[PDB]
């Protein structure tokens, strides 16, 4: 299977430079072009450029010609995209895509790059214990509160990905303090609260922090 | 985006056919391969159509693409709620020497059943209270249409400060999700008898209350 794995989300200061990596697997690295596409929050797709992994030829779009530099490492089947003179307006999700079938047939997961003068901040995870009066028949709601982190994003899984039924990770809210907070809740059978173990796995790549918080019955 | 012109939105009742046109010129569409891309809410873009009419594996046959002259068209038969997403037209422009995407076209299915919101309110955790903080978490989910208003009350009086509410967000099952947070100090939490989260949706209100006890 063709897979394109990108580097994690990061905070960058204005004027700095960042290099996003894209490791290619499942296909011959030197047989296909590689594209880069950026998408600002709530905006459309913007093509950035294309690289030929065999000889290293690059061609960038007009908007990004003065600040983007794309390289590649054939030994590791990895394409790099460097954005210099970073600015607040560069905050976006950056994708690599394989240039098969004369289009962009396989995409990476995307890398959310935030440009800000504020520093990164790890999250504070608190349990949301399932209450008794808040239950709904045979189902109960329990979750984790991920408070006061910067920047986005954070990924929440339950039982290391072994629990996906009923899981709902809500979008984050931007507080007046400039920090984000969100909640992830899984609907669980109300009778298996005492037997089943419920762990929320919170990952904040920009701070290089992972928290596995255990949610107990109240 | 400017060289490729897409409609901002297309709509059709469930089970009907929708059509998205992508208009360009001889420099891009009239002479180069056209591809279409689908972006489900909260997901990365994926290839829907390549080489103007070919479907990769995993794409339902309800999706169809074609090209005529300097325009390309994406067709979706039997429109289901799972097709609601942003659709992008893409091709190569020989004048610019660049790959170009059209502006997003949002597909919306009309006549969707009304969903009354489900409200779940969490009191501050003991861990947070031991950490000199307190936050009330009100979670609203499975509502349609996606317009909710949240009101908070200390006992029976409104609270305006410390209230942060998200914009309604599209869930994966379509429908909608929202969350509202009320930030308190541990003093104000234990000092009151009850705190309330009221959610108004389509002229009807669902209210849940929690108490320090």
């Amino acid at each position: 299977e063709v897979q394109l794995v990108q580097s994690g989300a990061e905070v960058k200061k204005p004027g700095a430079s960042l290099k996003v990596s894209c490791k290619a697997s499942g296909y011959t690295f030197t047989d296909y072009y590689m594209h880069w596409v950026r998408q600002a929050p709530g905006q459309g797709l913007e093509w950035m450029g294309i690289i030929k992994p065999s000889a290293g030829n690059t061609r960038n779009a007009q908007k990004f010609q003065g600040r983007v530099t794309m390289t590649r490492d054939t030994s590791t089947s990895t394409v790099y995209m460097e954005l210099s003179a970073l600015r607040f307006e560069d905050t976006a999700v950056y994708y690599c895509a394989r240039g098969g079938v004369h289009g962009l047939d396989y995409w990476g997961q995307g890398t959310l790059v935030t440009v800000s003068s504020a520093s990164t901040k790890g999250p504070s995870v608190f349990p949301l214990a399932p209450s008794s009066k808040s239950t709904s028949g045979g189902t109960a709601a329990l979750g984790c509160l991920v408070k006061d982190y910067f920047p986005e994003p954070v990924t929440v899984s339950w039982n290391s990905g072994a629990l996906t039924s009923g899981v709902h990770t809500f979008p984050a809210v931007l507080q007046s303090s400039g920090l984000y907070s969100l909640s992830s809740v899984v609907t669980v059978p109300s009778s298996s609260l005492g037997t089943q173990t419920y762990i929320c796995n919170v990952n904040h790549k920009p701070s290089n922090t992972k928290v596995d918080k255990r949610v107990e019955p109240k | 985006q400017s060289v490729l012109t897409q409609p901002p939105s297309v709509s059709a009742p469930p089970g009907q056919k929708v059509t998205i046109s992508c208009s360009g010129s001889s420099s891009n569409i009239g002479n180069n391969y056209v591809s279409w891309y689908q972006q489900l809410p909260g997901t990365a873009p994926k290839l829907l159509i390549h080489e103007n009419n070919q479907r990769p594996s995993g794409i339902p046959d309800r999706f169809s693409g074609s090209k005529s002259g300097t325009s390309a068209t994406l067709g979706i038969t039997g429109l289901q709620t799972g097709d609601e997403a942003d659709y992008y037209c893409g091709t190569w422009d020989t004048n610019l020497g660049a790959f170009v995407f059209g502006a997003a076209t949002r597909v919306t299915v009309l006549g969707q059943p009304k969903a009354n919101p489900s409200v779940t309110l969490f009191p501050p955790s003991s861990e947070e209270l031991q950490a000199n903080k307190a936050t009330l978490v009100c979670l609203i989910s499975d509502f349609y249409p996606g317009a909710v208003t949240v009101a908070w009350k200390a006992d029976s009086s409104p609270v305006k400060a410390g209230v942060e509410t998200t914009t309604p967000s599209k869930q994966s099952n379509n429908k909608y999700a929202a969350s509202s947070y009320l930030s308190l100090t541990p003093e104000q939490w234990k000092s009151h008898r009850s705190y309330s989260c009221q959610v108004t949706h389509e002229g009807s209100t669902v209210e849940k209350t929690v108490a320090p006890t």
Binding site: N57, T58, R59, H102 | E51, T91, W92, T94
Partner: peptide, 14 residues
């Protein structure tokens, strides 16, 4: 150069 652009024009041409 324009050679790479000409390569891409040839590739994407339908």
């Amino acid at each position: 150069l324009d050679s790479f652009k000409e390569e891409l024009d040839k590739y994407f041409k339908n």
